[PDB]
Ligand binder design. Structure first.
Ligand SMILES: NC(=O)C1=CN([C@@H]2O[C@H](COP(=O)(O)OP(=O)(O)OC[C@H]3O[C@@H](n4cnc5c(N)ncnc54)[C@H](OP(=O)(O)O)[C@@H]3O)[C@@H](O)[C@H]2O)C=CC1
Ligand SMILES: NC(=O)C1=CN([C@@H]2O[C@H](COP(=O)(O)OP(=O)(O)OC[C@H]3O[C@@H](n4cnc5c(N)ncnc54)[C@H](OP(=O)(O)O)[C@@H]3O)[C@@H](O)[C@H]2O)C=CC1
Ligand SMILES: C#CCN(Cc1ccc2[nH]c(N)nc(=O)c2c1)c1ccc(C(=O)N[C@@H](CCC(=O)O)C(=O)O)cc1
Ligand SMILES: C#CCN(Cc1ccc2[nH]c(N)nc(=O)c2c1)c1ccc(C(=O)N[C@@H](CCC(=O)O)C(=O)O)cc1
Ligand SMILES: COc1ncc(-c2cccc(N3CCN(c4cnc(N)nc4N)CC3)c2)cn1
Ligand SMILES: COc1ncc(-c2cccc(N3CCN(c4cnc(N)nc4N)CC3)c2)cn1
Ligand SMILES: O=c1ccn([C@H]2C[C@H](O)[C@@H](COP(=O)(O)O)O2)c(=O)[nH]1
Ligand SMILES: O=c1ccn([C@H]2C[C@H](O)[C@@H](COP(=O)(O)O)O2)c(=O)[nH]1
Lengths: 511, 511
């Protein structure tokens, strides 16, 4: 019973010019070091590698300490490796075998009592040979989210859908997303599947007296998206069937919380492609305090059209609104809170309270202040809006390390559709704000009120929950030097790096 | 050889009156009792042991207790006094009569080994006194009845009776949430005498894996107050030390949640006494839309005075504010959002948005509406306020079964002093609104922004955490018929039933 341990691009690339295709991945190496060494007393592990893999290592690190180094090679001799560097005392001498079947036979003969776990470390020669013989019980895969130029590739295998879109291998473990040198990645493991408390118990047994899960197989679920998935599953399992303003039935839960890290990667959800062009163009729209939805619509972003139609504005009891007008909406309250609205064309400069500018000036001069809030809810002008704000409130926070976090409260949540859009939108705002203030982005926290999935979306969401997440992408702000204030961002100032989602899921917007 | 004791108990240790139970029928208790005495892991059954009067107090259809070996301790009653009392059913075990508890335990070993699984002393005072003296009691199953009743028979005093009320040891290993039957709150505690299948997943868990705990013995944590206790513990252990607008050192955290049930009992926290006279007077102050802190100050609630002083009013740059005037405070926006403020004496009826009216109306008519929100935060009006509202927003949610839930978001949370007050203050509003809208109260959800403990409380809080919580009380609304609007309520229309909190800890208010 052997295990494979690899780092791998989406297109299964592993090496180039007999070296790693990426810049050094410190957290990947630490993870490698730990897996290959650790043991529950008397036994050391074994690291089986090829010649090209052995050679590609730095001289400093070979032989890999505390582990039986076995090199599969015909051309290299057992003494050339011995003459390469003097051996340090306390380690088994590096062993050379003809092929991989012969390599494991060596452990059967001479090391039957000493070795605990067996690890094949590279490369494509030994990996291919390992999967051929099928003696691999487990695969420890580091999924590099970014694509890199490669000439050596890891062989494709049943259930390699965990890398990109297309005896079996099922994921049992998915870690949260890590990053090094602007390279996002995460760790997965895959399985070859094909009376101190006796007194308490009966009190618990009677105490209960009273269906769907996200990716059942995956038992350790480090990935942060699991929040959102388990949140879908929960409302499908434990929510309440409700009616609606829209006329479409709803399953709703009240009081819901999600939080996502910003320090390593960006929570652009992977289980379905997120319309990022939308979250970007809409956020810049908000920041401008723009209330004209045509400016969005023309850019290819049609998210607001149905709620600013001639038909909808009349039902929303505003016959004197122009098509495209969202009223004094999200962005208007941010940049001009309380100001007298006229139309989308009127210039509202200097009028009202610019919450966004004050939130920054507070962050930049006095970050411990507890009044760093931006609201979109104005009970005075709710009726003048074409549709009341969902994401209505957000608070900011700085710690010791000059790291920035952001809470956002949402009154009403279309989990299937709006939520992943909302996560990504505000997390982006945190990145923007953090940069302008000279702070590290840390964490984004999502507070939810009415949290609901629409009944017509339910079939599509079970489809989404069969999908195990991919590593998060990195969002980079570009022209970091050129942008100094929050209004200096443009659409081209951003870069989504290594975003490899699952295929598009179609979901109708509830009018 | 070891025995378990199973009792229900008044805070004053009372167990009986007039050879019967002191309280009305508690179904959930009798359920607990039935299951705990009966449930057994094959060829095996449980023994129940009682006094003569316990046997007599018990209704005829229930004695002897089915599926359990009954033993009555008596010297007047004989074994044939009981056999003639009711024909024995086929299969059941005969009731045995011993003259003392040592004889009872002796009989159990002498004749009933290999026969009886577990031994339960069931009552009354005499046998509970006897069992505690012998030191044979391994576990105490206490049903803490929170309400004080007329009692002539009492459970004996024991080391560890600090779980009942204020003052070889008996410490809690289990505390459940508060239940209620017939206007009576209660909860269940258990006390203890002290004086590569999945292992291939575990190596990656090694490196990823890594001080103050409250009531650490309590292995089961049903009691919803544990949420708050652990929230204090987390802030201290895992928080970051910030400086403060007041100057006093702060340990703080961002984005933490709590939720409390309102269908069984009231989350008026028990681990320290909460100033309920304040929570009631402050809320009815808000409801009236009052901005005059002297109306609270004259009534014995001085919670706002340190913030309406001439010094603080001038430090907030408001020279013309009279002493007492909070400016457009929380009460003000609730009923007059956007109204132009003058002083506390000016009459504002009709001006601004009456959010509270709109909330109740939307509730009583269109409960599936998601715009059912109230907000104290008014960016344009913040400057004129003596203090920017801490609790700034609440949302209401109505269920399938006409069940009301409420979320409240609080930007800044004094976890030592303000948080339990706020839990109490909105749970009360939720009760009030529910009655006024003809709805069953279900849940209060607390969303928290800057969640912090002051450093001149750290010592005073570590002490509090040593205290395990008592059952929650019931808050009843008196004069239900007379009250039909939210303004109809007065301080007298309420009654806190079964409140048994721990001693007061002195915590100064930060100005
Ligand atoms: N991403 C990752 O996790 C890792 C990537 N790498 C990368 O992989 C590349 C090196 O791997 P690769 O190019 O595939 O070369 P290999 O590491 O597979 O080694 C090739 C040589 O080893 C011998 N060999 C290998 N497999 C067998 C076998 N089954 N039977 C007999 N002999 C065998 C052969 O010798 P002969 O010709 O004499 O038969 C062959 O020439 C480098 O670019 C390196 O950076 C390396 C380690 C980890
Ligand atoms: N809430 C609860 O958990 C429970 C409450 N109760 C309440 O308690 C009351 C009955 O209990 P209580 O009044 O204490 O009476 P008991 O049930 O303790 O029975 C009293 C009789 O039992 C015998 N006896 C008990 N202990 C001893 C001893 N150590 N040595 C010798 N004889 C003993 C004596 O019988 P004799 O005189 O024949 O020798 C005595 O007269 C009822 O009102 C009942 O409702 C009862 C059980 C549980
Ligand atoms: C949230 C928000 C902003 N908005 C505004 C907006 C307004 C009313 C709404 N009403 C309802 N019922 N659900 C919504 O998601 C919604 C969203 C959006 C509107 C539509 C889409 C939409 O049709 N979905 C995108 C997919 C984007 C994604 O991956 O999330 C699409 O493919 O068209 C997204 C966002
Ligand atoms: C929250 C809030 C509203 N308020 C108003 C108010 C105003 C300024 C504040 N400032 C600070 N820093 N913390 C607060 O909790 C606080 C509270 C209160 C203020 C004080 C007390 C107080 O002194 N404690 C109570 C004891 C209550 C308990 O034990 O929990 C007392 O006995 O007076 C209570 C409520
Ligand atoms: C950029 O500098 C650099 N870059 C690389 C090295 C290095 C030094 C020793 C050895 C190696 N490898 C050994 C094996 N590997 C591996 C990494 N992660 C996983 N999950 N599986 C692997 N099988 C990477 C290749 C790499 C030194 N220096
Ligand atoms: C008024 O109706 C009513 N009222 C009372 C009864 C009743 C029926 C069986 C038995 C009894 N006991 C009195 C209460 N006991 C008890 C209850 N909880 C705990 N935790 N420990 C106990 N020792 C034991 C025995 C009471 C029936 N009917
Ligand atoms: O950012 C958004 C915008 C809209 N919605 C969804 C949720 C609601 O179902 C609907 C708005 O309608 P009301 O909540 O106003 O009824 O749009 C979101 O989830 N997020
Ligand atoms: O109802 C209240 C009133 C006050 N505070 C506390 C929290 C903060 O510690 C302090 C307000 O300080 P600023 O957030 O305004 O700085 O008062 C509450 O938690 N709840």
């Amino acid at each position: 019973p052997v295990c494979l341990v690899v780092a791998m691009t989406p297109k299964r690339g592993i090496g180039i010019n007999n070296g790693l295709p990426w810049p050094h991945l410190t957290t990947d190496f630490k993870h490698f070091s730990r897996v290959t060494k650790t043991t529950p007393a008397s036994r050391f592990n074994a690291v089986v590698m090829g010649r090209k893999t052995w050679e590609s290592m730095p001289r400093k690190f070979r032989p890999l300490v505390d582990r039986l180094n076995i090199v599969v090679s015909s051309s290299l001799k057992e003494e050339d490796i011995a003459a390469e560097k003097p051996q340090a005392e306390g380690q088994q001498r590096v062993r050379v075998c003809a092929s991989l079947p012969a390599a494991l036979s060596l452990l059967e003969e001479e090391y039957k009592d000493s070795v605990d776990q067996i690890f094949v470390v590279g490369g494509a020669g030994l990996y291919e040979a390992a999967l051929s013989l099928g003696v691999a019980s487990h695969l420890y895969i580091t999924r590099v989210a970014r694509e890199f130029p490669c000439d050596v590739f890891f062989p494709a295998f049943p259930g390699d859908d965990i890398l990109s879109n297309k005896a079996t291998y099922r994921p049992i473990f998915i870690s949260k997303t890590f990053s090094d040198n602007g390279v996002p990645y995460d760790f997965v493991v895959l399985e070859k599947r094909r009376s101190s408390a006796a007194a308490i118990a009966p009190v618990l047994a009677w105490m209960d007296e009273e269906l769907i899960r996200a990716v059942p197989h995956v038992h350790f679920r480090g990935h942060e998206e699991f929040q959102y998935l388990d949140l879908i599953a929960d409302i499908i399992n434990n929510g309440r069937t409700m009616d609606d303003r829209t006329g479409v039935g709803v399953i709703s839960k009240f009081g819901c919380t999600m939080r996502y890290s910003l320090d390593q990667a960006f929570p652009l959800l992977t289980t379905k492609r997120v319309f990022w062009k939308g979250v970007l163009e809409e956020l810049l729209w908000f920041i401008r305090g723009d209330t004209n939805a045509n400016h969005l619509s023309e850019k290819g972003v049609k998210i607001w059209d149905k709620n600013v139609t001639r038909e909808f504005l009349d039902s929303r009891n505003l016959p004197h609104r122009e098509v495209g007008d969202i009223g004094p909406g999200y962005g208007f309250q941010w940049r001009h809170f309380g100001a007298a609205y006229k139309d989308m064309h009127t210039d509202y400069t200097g009028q009202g309270v610019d919450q966004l500018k004050n939130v920054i000036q507070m962050l930049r001069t006095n970050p411990t202040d507890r009044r760093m809030l931006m609201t979109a809810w104005n009970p005075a002008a709710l009726d003048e809006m074409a549709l009341p704000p969902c994401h209505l409130l957000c608070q900011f926070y700085v710690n010791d390390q000059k790291e920035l976090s952001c809470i956002m409260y949402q009154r009403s949540c279309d989990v299937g559709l709006g939520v992943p859009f909302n996560i990504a939108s505000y997390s982006l705002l945190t990145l923007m704000v953090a940069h302008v203030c000279n702070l590290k982005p840390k964490e984004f926290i999502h507070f939810m009120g009415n949290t609901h999935v629409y009944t017509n979306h339910v079939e599509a969401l079970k489809e989404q929950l069969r999908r195990e997440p991919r590593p998060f992408p990195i969002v980079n702000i570009l022209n970091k030097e050129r942008i100094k204030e929050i209004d200096d961002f443009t659409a081209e100032d951003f870069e989504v790096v290594g975003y490899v989602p699952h295929g598009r899921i179609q979901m109708e917007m509830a009018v």
